Amino acid sequence: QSIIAYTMSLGAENSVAYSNNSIAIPTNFTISVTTEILPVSMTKTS
């Protein structure tokens, strides 16, 4: 257990096989739910 400093990684590493006569198509799906927050008002004074 200690403190370590480093250089971050931008993200994962991926490559896609590209060909002049190839294609891919999905077969199953999924339903997802997300949440977002937004402020509206603020307090009145005198």
Q: Which residues bind other proteins (CB under 8 A)?
A: 10-42
Q: Token digits for 2?
A: 């200690």
Nearer of residues 1 and 18 to other proteins, judged by Cβ: 18
Q: CB of residue 1 vs other proteins: minimum separation in angstroms?
A: 27
23-29-32 Cα angle (round to 5): 130
Distances (CA, A) of 40 to 2, 25, 32: 43, 43, 26
Q: CB of residue 9 vs other proteins: minimum separation in angstroms?
A: 9
Q: CB of residue 26 vs other proteins: minimum separation in angstroms?
A: 4
